[PDB]
Amino acid sequence: PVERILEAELAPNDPVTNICQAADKQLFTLVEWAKRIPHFSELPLDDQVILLRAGWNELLIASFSHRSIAVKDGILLATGLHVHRNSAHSAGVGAIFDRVLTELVSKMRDMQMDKTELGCLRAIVLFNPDSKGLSNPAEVEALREKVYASLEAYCKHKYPEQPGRFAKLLLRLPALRSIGLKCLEHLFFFKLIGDTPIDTFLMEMLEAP
Amino acid sequence: DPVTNICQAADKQLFTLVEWAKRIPHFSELPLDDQVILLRAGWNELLIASFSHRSIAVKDGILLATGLHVHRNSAHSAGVGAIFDRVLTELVSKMRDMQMDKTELGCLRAIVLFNPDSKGLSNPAEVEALREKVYASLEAYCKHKYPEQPGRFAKLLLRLPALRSIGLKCLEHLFFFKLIGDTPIDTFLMEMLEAP
Amino acid sequence: DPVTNICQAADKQLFTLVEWAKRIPHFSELPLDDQVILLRAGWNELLIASFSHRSIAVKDGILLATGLHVHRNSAHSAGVGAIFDRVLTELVSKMRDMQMDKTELGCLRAIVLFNPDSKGLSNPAEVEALREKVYASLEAYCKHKYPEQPGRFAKLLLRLPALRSIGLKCLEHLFFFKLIGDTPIDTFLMEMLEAP
Amino acid sequence: PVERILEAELAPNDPVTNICQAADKQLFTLVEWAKRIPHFSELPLDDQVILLRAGWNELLIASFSHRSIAVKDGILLATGLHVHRNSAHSAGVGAIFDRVLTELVSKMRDMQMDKTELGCLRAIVLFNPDSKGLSNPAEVEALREKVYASLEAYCKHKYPEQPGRFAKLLLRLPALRSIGLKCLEHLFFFKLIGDTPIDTFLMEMLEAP
Numbered sequence A, D: 001p002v003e004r005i006l007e008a009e010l011a012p013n014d015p016v017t018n019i020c021q022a023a024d025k026q027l028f029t030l031v032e033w034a035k036r037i038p039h040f041s042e043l044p045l046d047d048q049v050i051l052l053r054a055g056w057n058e059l060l061i062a063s064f065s066h067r068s069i070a071v072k073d074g075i076l077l078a079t080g081l082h083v084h085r086n087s088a089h090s091a092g093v094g095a096i097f098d099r100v101l102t103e104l105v106s107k108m109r110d111m112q113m114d115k116t117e118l119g120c121l122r123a124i125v126l127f128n129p130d131s132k133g134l135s136n137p138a139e140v141e142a143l144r145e146k147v148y149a150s151l152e153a154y155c156k157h158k159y160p161e162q163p164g165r166f167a168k169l170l171l172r173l174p175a176l177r178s179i180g181l182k183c184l185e186h187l188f189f190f191k192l193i194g195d196t197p198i199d200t201f202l203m204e205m206l207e208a209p
Numbered sequence B, C: 001d002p003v004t005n006i007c008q009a010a011d012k013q014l015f016t017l018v019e020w021a022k023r024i025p026h027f028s029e030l031p032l033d034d035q036v037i038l039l040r041a042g043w044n045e046l047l048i049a050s051f052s053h054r055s056i057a058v059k060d061g062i063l064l065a066t067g068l069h070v071h072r073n074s075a076h077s078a079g080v081g082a083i084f085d086r087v088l089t090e091l092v093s094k095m096r097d098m099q100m101d102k103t104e105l106g107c108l109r110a111i112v113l114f115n116p117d118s119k120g121l122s123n124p125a126e127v128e129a130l131r132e133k134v135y136a137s138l139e140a141y142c143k144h145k146y147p148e149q150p151g152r153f154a155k156l157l158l159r160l161p162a163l164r165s166i167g168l169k170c171l172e173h174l175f176f177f178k179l180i181g182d183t184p185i186d187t188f189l190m191e192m193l194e195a196p
Ligand SMILES: CC1=C(CCc2nnn[nH]2)c2cc(F)ccc2/C1=C\c1ccc(C(C)C)cc1
Pocket: B006, B009, B010, B013, B064, B065, B068, B170, B171, B172, B173, B174, B175, B176, B177, B178, B180, B181, B182
């Protein structure tokens, strides 16, 4: 149900604890979104955990990448923190930042990917049948197939002048995959929201006696 | 000697790859530097896609293009069991179960080759345009060979994220060295130590 | 909850680390930005050095700073047995065998902290100068405390390459996540999924 | 023993095959050097192989780093090939290359590390008792200890005005270790000697029918 996926999408100083709380909040947002995706909650809870663990990075990146179409040559996080290249280059994650801009954000803008298409792609990512430890990979594959079947129908209806649009959307996923991998190994997300609170906390303690 | 054999095999494989790309429609029409960049960016995934599909008739193993067979027990022995299992489960077994044919493999490899995200491309838009012509043709193919499988085309495209990450994990784990280079290097070094 | 405990423990460890550095001679005299760079560049090796030395009275395991004990059986379960064994064999057991004392550990940690190769340092030469004063002090210590062991000072310094690569490998294998974060995250996610 | 360590130091298109032969030559130079190191050849042959496998990268880097003391912002190879920073940045290995320059070449230059000192440091690297699979780790440690004992005596004799020189040499090894690791994971060596022959072979074949 493409209508159901679109409604899912729409709906002091102790630095490490503060960062974890932000991660907590963002993770919960993802869980709530997944629950609104049709049939996800019908999967075993152990399978739901595995899918979220396998997908959380790509799912987060896809979100703030699409959110950043409106913003100006930077990345808009959910927290409202507008991060520019130099903040990313200062954090030691400039390379990833450029790829996110080039391979995802810019491309989404150029093709004007909408929230329904974004939602479907993330549902496809969520329904990842290659996730290790699944009790029943086949039903996960089945749910993913229902999603892109629905996405394709949506594209041919809303954009009949673009017959290659559906495949174009799908072929952003390899970039999302590779960028996802780089983010986990550089602690991209936790560096971006964490560098300032840590440096600030550091400065205060070093200046104090 | 095993080391020279591997290096020769690489050269032959590289020759075969370059000849293959030149027979892909409109590849040679791209600027030469762009042709090089694409081949530079793609050789790993192109190679993995090739031996994965080649290994469909193999049980619990892979076939490298010169009758070189590697079993998973050996793969786990060499410390790359995890990435090896990923090749088996995410690529080989999926290719087997849906019976991906050589025409389908060819199109998917052409899509991999026509990678507009490759850094340094002078005309990324032209590369993207050629990719679109490739997957349009692949969709047309799937529709007529398997009309009863409307999701087949998308299902093919959705192996590419797996190929991408497997390719990356392979390089980071020295996949090929640990599987085919490890023992020849011991032999190599022993021979050097045998020198006067 | 298991997760909050870890972040709270992390904050405390970070607090302890900063205070330790501030009591290192001439550390607070460095420019503030350089102090931050040094603490950022060094915290991993500094922390690893600490719990390694703490774990000398433990067999086949490590003691993390809040009574948190991890045995090698658990580490292999979590998929980080190799790096864990390196910590055991290259650091802990070596610290045990030469009976490295806390003064020697302190100096080595001070040397790690005063890292002149740290990128972005405003005055690398002053950092190097402070490092030299530290290892001059450590040599004097080794000479007079253990005169019958003339190679001891060098033996201490030559654990630093092992510390360096282990620090790098720990981060690349998500060592700490896999040992103390993995299971709490499953519990965490389950709690979220069972929520209204 | 230090005199022998100094004497050890003193003494048409198939691109991959051509790269392998170059690697072959360079590796053998290292093996021949190790054989002249006292007591090395007395170790079991399986242990010698293990030590060379564990050390070959660091041993090579130390060599061309020290050789590059005379040159400006580049690396001088055994083949006589002068590789510059920007040529390395073009190959996608700019970050490591600079680290080699800053943390090794420059440091070797500033303290005027001599070939005896280089030779001793490489012997220390070679005699790595942490190498996995050694039949007798203790005798390797024993050999390493004999080396740095000899190196220290050499430093205090030749440079009595520099009492911290010996420790200064030893404390380049953590940097050598970390740079060594980065080189294995970026295919540093095989990119440096390999990028040009491959691009050439590609261009000529793509130009051909
Ligand atoms: C890239 C690469 C390394 C460099 C290190 C590496 N990177 N990723 N995996 N290994 C290596 C090292 C070796 F020893 C042997 C092979 C290789 C190799 C590639 C390769 C793959 C398959 C084949 C078959 C056609 C025979 C030949 C060469």
